[model samples]
Target chain A: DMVTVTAKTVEEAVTKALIELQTTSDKLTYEIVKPAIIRAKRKETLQDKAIEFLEQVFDAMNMAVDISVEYNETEKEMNVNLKGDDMGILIGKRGQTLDSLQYLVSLVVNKSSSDYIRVKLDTENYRERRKETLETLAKNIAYKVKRTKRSVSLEPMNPYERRIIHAALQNDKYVVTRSDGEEPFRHVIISLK
Target chain B: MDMVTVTAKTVEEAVTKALIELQTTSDKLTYEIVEKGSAGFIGSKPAIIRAKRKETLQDKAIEFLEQVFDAMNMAVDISVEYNETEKEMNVNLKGDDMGILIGKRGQTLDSLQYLVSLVVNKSSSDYIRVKLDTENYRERRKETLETLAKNIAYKVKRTKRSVSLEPMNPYERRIIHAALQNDKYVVTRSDGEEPFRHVIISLKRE
Candidate 1:
């Protein structure tokens, strides 16, 4: 037999669960689960939900920006693509805003859907092409370092690109890597050690 | 008109005379030069002279490496190769006690690389990238990092918790991050302060 209990807050829920089990809270291990009623409804398809969420997010942030959502039901993925005169504001420094939005949408969708799904957010295909470009930059720098026996400093890059550089030459034996400068001006420097 | 020719011993002097004669345009322009001197028994050879443009930013960078070695009174061979398509310059040095060039944790080499870049940039209006390598140190370092990353990743997986590696230079941490970035079950992140802070790889929760 299963016991059902409802409490207004998480603390109250824990207390009720402990009372029902006739055990101290210390002895009980509980996984915090979101209340079903509080979870968002799945009436709209995942694509429609993603678009609605993006629109609501922009509205809450009070930014008048245009965003388009493309969905692939077979893949259970939604692509939230944004474009506008002020899209840069949505991207933020290092796409932090965009990342945050993606994370929030993931949470909302997962809470509403019974099945697990993945959502990818992109802007002007920048992230995909940038990955390829950064990898090439890493190889070029590595080759130069190998030939010269000297360290080289590259222009500042975002955190993501720097990660790519590190990944590219992590197996290299001669070149060492580091980043310099603060955010919005941060750059990676590859050197010989 | 009768023609006469004079021979000069040095290439510089001969080139200077040629320049002057070319500048003086005569009305007739009909003078013919003939060699009166016979080839001596010694058989002296003429100096071959080639004109080259001024050194570029990359050229100065190679020169700077040579200067560093000279200052230390060390006899080392240095070679530089520049790739215009990649905008990268490579400096290779072969010598004894190159470990000294690397210095403590590569502090000395880092400083040298920085100085070279500064000089090269100041000398040129266009941007160029410079890389310095000594004795394949970077390649070896990369191997060590890959092993370290694998070991730490295993530990994190077994413990079922997040593990933070010691602060590493950006390059080292990057390797660690990249090695495990696609594990799917594991995620990697770099945190803490710079020049000392480092990477952490954790298992994703279901």
Candidate 2:
């Protein structure tokens, strides 16, 4: 006996139907049948979906960039790397464009997929370069805070950068680092301990 | 007008009565059974139901705010008014000691407003923007920032040096920029990143 079940996504509905009918996909034959709330389009794989979207994005911008996407099974994350000439445009100011692209790609990758996946994008090794810059800035700010005997607040930074500052000064005894304020305005504050 | 109470011989009939009274369909109606009907021949009583239409965008916004305040252990009287022309939902909260909601520089209020907008627009084709205010914080904060902006511009013009103001939200930043837009003696620009993005006032280049 076939019973009807409904869910927001196909996988969820299938799971419900499967449990009730006590059968696997091979044994169960089911047909599927919304406005306002559009469902995420089914895709072959998260990697393929991410790359396809990126290809269209690059094509629209008229940029020649070699894109590579790989899934790190061990880390359970998707890595997207781009290599090309004059990548400054893609990187934008302070990697804002790259960050935005990463967010969009993540949205597309996780749109229809059941499992949540983390997406990381890098170009011209900007991630590493920026990482080192933040580490250095952290130490420098620590020194200033110690010398001035007062707390110092840095410019607003993303969570990643704020964490870098915290970790870089983890061993310092003279000062400590903490993040405060609301998002998009949150920044790291270093103060003498 | 959004809800109705109905009585009928059966539960289904009572629900149908509610749907008809609300001028909605079964799919759009949600109800609670107030009292069950009796099928006994002697002294038969009708079913009673309290029903209302399913949550619209405005209803959802109000519910979300109520939930948030409930979680925070705050007793607030919330009033929501919609401007169909601009598709904006204006939410005003009335209560004592509303300063906590405003946070530092109205950050807490802005955060709540952002979340309400997200909830309201979750399933709507037409975007509904949510503007939340408590204790008349928005207008008062705007005036304070405008005055501060002019003072900073004057200070920058006199010293011929750049001065960076404390980080402000984009809404306040716009106020600062607009306040000093016509000042030929100084220039204003925002720099740094979010949560820490600040406006820098400097002498205009000759």
Candidate 3:
């Protein structure tokens, strides 16, 4: 259990605490047990660390932003919703900028520890919209290959995208999926069997 | 538990510096006061303060990927370039026999980066990122997504149900989000978290 001292008055508690602490107030801090009652010092949680990063960015961007944070104690996870308009710059070119912003918040949250805690940054429902686009694209490509009766090579994609392409056509008996190409540009190719 | 350690004249001093480094006014961390050094004055000792900015996404990324390498019976050397200004970390892999690490079209490398990112930020108070690369693969693969987006956008317009792509790391997921925008009849959205943040494509609603 965490050790904390409780007292009726802040001054009286700190006096005993300083004796108990074997330290001086000039070199120490304390927490408020209640009105006028205080004890030893404490620190901030991940939720607050988020504010420092936000203020740094939001202030610099010259934008008035509203932040809503939902903290998951069980997993130590936090999701931040940054609400603002004309925030296309935050979303960046194709959202690399938005993702970068999200990553930047995470860096501030997890600077040196190995414990797992994440903060998801969303603005203008950007994340949900992005997911919808990828899903439909995968569907369109599969039908195109089936109608054309020709193998189609997809651009370079990460495992996630390739997995989507393969999943969309996983059940197609007339088509097969294989990844080809070399280094970076290597991609998924859909072909007729 | 997720923080870095520091030493100072007292617990207050160390925690003070940590608070400054963390750039916060809230005081919520507990310190284990280390033993004393007697040189300055009577009954005075320097304190070794153990604190944590948080457990990094970068470290967890390395730890998680190491297990992946372990399964393949391969090893590597990784050098990191942390850009404090940009809040970006670039991890470069080096090894004598690191061919499989890059995989077909840098797919394996992409997955590693994706996985590491997941490990680091399963979900954050501050947003930090770790980008992985081996031999200039990011630039090469980016063009690949551009062309791939063009194909997917053309056929995606006529569909009733949206198409679902596999789980892309957040970065790649958003990359496609930009390319397909206004290029055709589709838009993109993301679903899930960390290990499964796949992007979906759909016809833009009127």
Candidate 4:
């Protein structure tokens, strides 16, 4: 049953609608249809928090730096690239400085955000360069292990570098790789089939 | 090479002030107390300390090892060569009965090395790896393991049978697994639980 009733008030209109529809108000639902106007409030998001923290860090160091962040929603990873002069100083010995900054950024981001987001800091292509070097080293060590019939334990690598070595040798039929020891001393060993 | 003198309400606050001035964290700062402060009715003395940013992780590692060896009553001559690019410190110990340090597959040496690493990293800005070797035991053991692996691998291949060697640590087992990994006729896999885990060399079936 359908009806359109306009009355002096909402209850009168609803009662008119119910009587015409032959239904009690309990069994009826009616919308007071009106035109739509929508508005939303703005708030600082995770990206803004990440940038604010990094800006203060650079400011304190007295360095003029540009920070660009690429956040992958699917992966929940924030890839940050830094551009500036004397970036090597920021990179430090073996990217330790970079790694430390990255850790602090992640802590800042995770504190504000409900879900944890991984933050990676990069400067002057250090991460990619390091990755290439490790991959080549892995291949060379695997060759040496196969030739001498001996396993070779590479120097301790940070977990990321160790993963690069393992992934580089993952598909080698005649060789296998294993990681041993604890962090900061954890190392990769390459052996033959 | 500059040492800053700081006096604060407490020793920790003194170190914190030093860290702030040095633009470094507590782990990278080293300090020594020169004067202990006291509370008095008219004159409350603050703690005084001389501090500096720690340098040369190599020196820190050697100092820790010396202390450890002294407590053990073992007089061992320690020589360390540090590779800056690799960030690795190779410490060689020369003394009588160095075999005791080797400790059945270098367990004692590993423990000592781990402890030294902890000490070195305690105040280091970067990770400094420490490898302790005594009397060329590490290289000698590696060579012996390679030979044993090859010999056992050959025996297993000829007889078309599986052979399990005595339980070895993860490092030693890596040698055995590597030695036979390239041999098409044989395969290697570690078996059993840790501290009892041994590698088995078996003929690969077509």
Candidate 5:
């Protein structure tokens, strides 16, 4: 025999399942299956964990670092702003170290709780200001490419930075862009038609 | 001579029809058509048809990726792959020292992906999904995640407790979840939001 269970809410659905299985509430182990919209709960837990994780990561690297967190409960996200001297180690090469730390923090939070929240970690408004500067440079270089009709080589940048340049000129028909060279010397070249 | 005039419910549709008719018939005649009534009056309203060229969805997707890259202050080569069957566009990025584009567990890439979809949707009515990838990072990450999940599952079986891995992007986390979905000894779940989301494998303890 087969059983069908239907309920308007998850709680109701679970109750029906328990009854069909002839199981008591105490006999069943229940876990909250998270919904996509429950970001706030997740964010709060992650923010708390991130601050702790960064402190430990910085300590392990023999650097003193201070990290502050601001949570937007409504948005179900938190902003972790870090500041300290010798913080270069935390950011690592192209922020790889920092990324790894953040990833670890996320693990700590999610393992302890169930909520789908996001955390954004940054230092000295680096992400915001960098984006603005990149946009301006892209436009200037694009115009130059259109005018000179010559390939221009830009300074080597990380993958993130290169993406910015490529994005800036994607629509300009007069020139096409490609990144050349290897790590540390890698740069973007804007070639003209 | 008889002069016949036709009207359409919408100006855009009317203009499109007119252009098609002219092209099909090879009509060389030109005439000035003017609206004789104001739009406020019933049955006296005149439709003003204007012909405009529409930008395709692909054009918008390219523009979006470019803008996002510009915002990030990076230079790279972007190639767009459109899968008609899936109704999705994958933006593949190639550049030097581009690891930062993935950010912490691909947080930045995910954000960029969201922004790309926003811009592309705004520019056109087509419902298309946008996926952003760089230097095959997503594929390589997927493999790493799968291995990690299996390893963690084995660990959890021995420890009889939950083992947590580092947070990862949705793509990476999904790979972990799928890898352990069928294991009888343990269960897996992804916890937390992006940029800090991770997965845990736990023994089915009584």
Candidate 6:
């Protein structure tokens, strides 16, 4: 019997479909009808658009660097990586220049897309190196503060860096962190718990 | 004198209905939007817009999508809103299990919108992009992404360092990238791995 049964969950729906058929347990097969392959294609095309636009940018800047992309369809993410010589200039004063490029590529993407998506551009794995450096600073400072048992103030930083410090010491038993001051120099203070 | 008037709770709804009935894309005609359209509450006293079909096609796109939801045993309805000038439409999905419908990071909704576009425009010469939004999901997510950008921007300025974020859906990553563009802050990039893929907000390397 080709009976349609409405159930709250897929599991329930499948079970009900089996019960109505009532021949053998393995008789009925399950198939996911949702469009999968095509879905990836659309998103994939968008990523391509992001990459192609950025290529123009790098060429326009005439920067000497090798470019690569790491796209994971299952996770729905893209990582546009940069490598090669003269990366120092390409990276800018502090990755400020890199940030601008990332921002522009994203805008081109927005203009071309009806849906929202993200694309990341990196060079020399600097982001990870910076994170490690931040985390280390948080620990070292956290340790000093623990012994002194008094809050130590650091120079003002942005919200992102503030989070790094706060997150790094978030689990520390003896130290707590807070942000004080205003923009440009919003500093983080570590004090004894 | 064939003047087709549409009324709904919102302006988009009226335009969508008009568009569907006309069986044509918005670009085909600017088709005068009625001056007396009113805005009150939905289902009670909604807004209204009057338009006429200058050209002809057949717009069974929404109806076909409705049947698709019906077959999937999912209850979904759309209130169509559109920007006539850009010739773009935004479909607002409502009704039941938005979490399930939206899936992770609104991918499911996006996929559905794209599917509808293909269905509708396959026969037409021009393409009209349709945006998918549910309630405030798009709005809220946009703000959250902006928040992340500012926070990371501050971090870069303070420490002259870049921070790597855990891998998230591609769209969310775009948020960080897009947010920084307007603020003119530190640079950002991405590193990949599955759950490990992430965007790194960094400062210019001198």
lDDT of 4 by residue, A1-193 (tens): 2345666566666566466555564445565633222111234466777887777655544457888898996898888888877464444243545655665566567766777687888886787898898899999998899999878889987655776898899999899988877665889989778
CA shift at B35, candidate 5, in angstroms? 99
In angstroms, the error of model 1 at B25 is: 23
DockQ computed for model 1 against the true two-chain complex using alpha carbons: 0.01
Per-residue accuracy of model 3 over B3-54 as CA lDDT, tens digit each: 5667677666778876776664444454555653344457666777666544
Tens-digit lDDT track of model 2 for B1-206: 46678899999899888888899887898899999899766889989988999877777777766665543445778888898789988989878645443435265566556556655765577888788987687888888999999998889888888999998766677689879989989988777765568889888886
The residue ranges of model 3 lying beyond 4 angstroms of the native Cα positions read A1-42, A58-65, A90-94, A111-115, A155-163, A179-187, B1-206
For each candidate, the alpha-carbon lDDT, in order, equals 0.62, 0.73, 0.63, 0.73, 0.62, 0.62
Which residue pairs collide in model 4, if any?
A192-B178, A192-B181, A193-B180, A193-B181, A193-B182
- The TM-score values for the models, in the order shown, are 0.37, 0.44, 0.39, 0.39, 0.37, 0.36
DockQ, in order, for the candidates?
A: 0.01, 0.02, 0.02, 0.01, 0.01, 0.02
Candidate 6 regions with alpha-carbon error over 4 angstroms: A1-48, A59-62, A90-92, B1-206
Model 6 error, position B202 (Å):
32
Name the lDDT value of residue B157 in candidate 6. Answer: 88
Instruction: Pick the TM-score winner.
Output: 2
Specify the poorest-scoring 10-residue window by lDDT in model 3 chain A. Answer: A88-97
Query: Which segments of model 2 are wrong by more than 4 Å?
Result: A1-193, B1-7, B16-28, B32-53, B73-75, B83-86, B101-105, B123-125, B159-161
Q: Looking at model 4 chain B, which ten-residue stretch has the lowest summed lDDT?
A: B99-108
Assign candidate 6 its CAPRI class. incorrect
Error at A185, model 3, angstroms: 5.2
Can you tell me which runs of candidate 5 are displaced by over 4 Å? Answer: A1-45, A88-97, A180-186, B1-206
TM-score of predicted structure 4, chain A:
0.62
> What tens-digit string does per-residue lDDT give for candidate 4 at B28-143?
88889988777778587898899888776677767666665553445888889999899888999887745453425354565566556655665667888789887788888889
Indicate the docking level reached by candidate 2: incorrect
TM-score of 6: 0.36
lDDT measured at residue B204 in model 4 versus the true structure, 0 to 100: 88
Model 3: CAPRI class: incorrect
